[PDB]
């Protein structure tokens, strides 16, 4: 959006639990799902090259 | 009653045929608990028919 | 004392000391809010005068509870200065982008004093709270609008969206209640802000509760006042059928008008104390 | 008296009811009775003139 979307506030994802909003709010711009893993700077690397 | 509200989200927000309702269905049967809560959103009906697949789904699944 | 009416029965008369006597218990004070306790005066069932003077004595009633239950001051004002004075704190020891724009922001955030009046308190929070939502759009280098003659809104800043619905829920309940609290269990401190974020999430909060128990306050007395004011122009302007002895005691008591609190205090005084001289002329049932 | 009358707490006036300790306050000294009509600088130049 305008704004950045720096911290933890906006992005949170279950799977396998029932989550409707997260799917009637799939394909607006705001909060941005997160899969709850961060790839370290190898894998980073890696998916760069 | 609660009833009309079954009734009325598995014929017009699930498009469910009659066959299948949840006198045959566990999943229906324990989700129309989840689908009577929630107001709004009834506009969308896609994205109650993807949830409703997302979690017959992960009913049937052996992990 | 005795808040003591001219028609009704007795179940009535309890009723609504019972009222009066649990304003602060019931949400929504309000007497347009609550229908029963309005319509219990009795319209269309008794005569104009008569019901015309209940409601008169019923909103003088009103106005001495709403003076009656003091909203303090104190704790909210020495909050706000120990948490402006923290936050311009928070704000030299932060390293922002550009330090003179931040500069003279902190230095309005350092003027924030106020003084024992409460008119010029609710317009210098919201420099003090312009000054802190920049400061807190700046420390995150977020962007913020520059339109030409254009304001920041007051906004929280770096929350979650049903955060921002519950903290709003409680914001209008202190508008509707504005002598009643309730307690805010959610916590405003969170792990993945900075503590510069969490001083000025405070003082938004703080600053938009003094804002709104200010505003609801002074809507509330301007419209009680006057209220009461249009209901004894109805009386005096109805006492002038009558040209008796007891109608005219009723019309000179009803001649002191009610632009101050101590006022209608007096009026109501005066009204109570001398009721049955009064009593006879007004027609019952 | 000794003491600034300002403290509008000590003020009052009733006219035409049975006021008797403003009948009281008859040659008192304390409690000063000023009608609720306070003039404004228009006719209070007028009286001064």
């Not at chain 2, 009653?1 to 566990?26: C, G, Q, Y």
């Not at chain 3, 209220?227 to 059928?241: F, S």
């Not at chain 3, 205090?265 to 005066?270: A, G, M, S, Y």
Request: proline share 3%; aromatic share 6%; glycine share 4%.
């Amino acid at each position: 959006d305008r704004q950045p979307l720096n911290p933890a506030n906006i992005e949170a994802r279950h799977h396998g639990v029932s989550d409707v909003p997260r799917l009637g709010a799939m394909d607006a711009d705001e909060p941005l799902f997160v899969d709850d893993y961060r790839a370290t700077d190898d894998e980073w690397t890696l998916q760069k090259v | 009653k609660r009833d009309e509200k079954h009734r009325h989200v598995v014929n017009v927000v699930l498009e469910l045929p009659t066959e299948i309702s949840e006198a045959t269905h566990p999943v229906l049967a324990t989700m129309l608990s989840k689908y009577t809560r929630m107001s709004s959103l009834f506009n969308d009906k896609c994205a109650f028919k993807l949830d409703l697949l997302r979690m017959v789904a992960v009913s049937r699944t052996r992990r | 004392m005795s808040l003591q009416f001219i028609g009704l029965q007795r179940r009535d008369v309890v009723a609504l000391v019972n009222f009066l006597r649990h304003l602060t218990q019931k949400p929504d004070v309000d007497l347009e809010a609550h229908p029963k306790i309005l319509k219990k005066c009795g319209e269309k069932r008794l005569h104009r005068r008569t019901v015309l003077f209940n409601e008169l004595m019923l909103w003088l009633g009103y106005y001495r509870e709403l003076r009656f239950h003091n909203p303090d001051l104190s704790s909210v004002l020495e909050e706000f200065e120990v948490r402006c004075v923290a936050v311009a704190r928070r704000g030299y020891t932060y390293p922002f982008g550009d330090r003179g724009k931040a500069r003279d922001h902190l230095a309005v955030l350092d003027r924030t004093e106020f003084d024992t009046d409460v008119r010029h308190d609710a317009e210098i929070v919201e420099r003090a709270l312009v000054s802190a939502v920049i400061l807190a759009k700046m420390s995150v280098r977020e962007t913020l609008v520059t339109a030409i003659g254009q304001t920041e809104p007051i906004a929280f800043v770096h929350l979650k969206d049903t955060e921002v619905q519950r903290i709003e829920e409680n914001l209008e309940g202190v508008r509707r209640n504005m002598f009643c609290v309730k307690p805010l269990d959610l916590n405003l401190d969170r792990h993945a802000n900075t503590a510069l974020v969490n001083a000025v999430n405070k003082l938004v909060y703080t600053g938009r509760l003094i804002m709104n128990v200010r505003r609801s306050w002074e809507e509330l007395e301007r419209k009680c006042l006057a209220r009461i004011q249009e209901r004894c122009k109805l009386l005096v302007k109805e006492l002038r059928m009558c040209l008796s002895f007891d109608s005219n005691y009723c019309r000179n008591i009803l001649k002191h008008a009610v632009e101050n609190g101590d006022s209608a205090d007096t009026l109501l005084e005066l009204l109570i104390e001398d009721f049955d001289i009064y009593v006879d002329s007004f027609p019952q049932s």
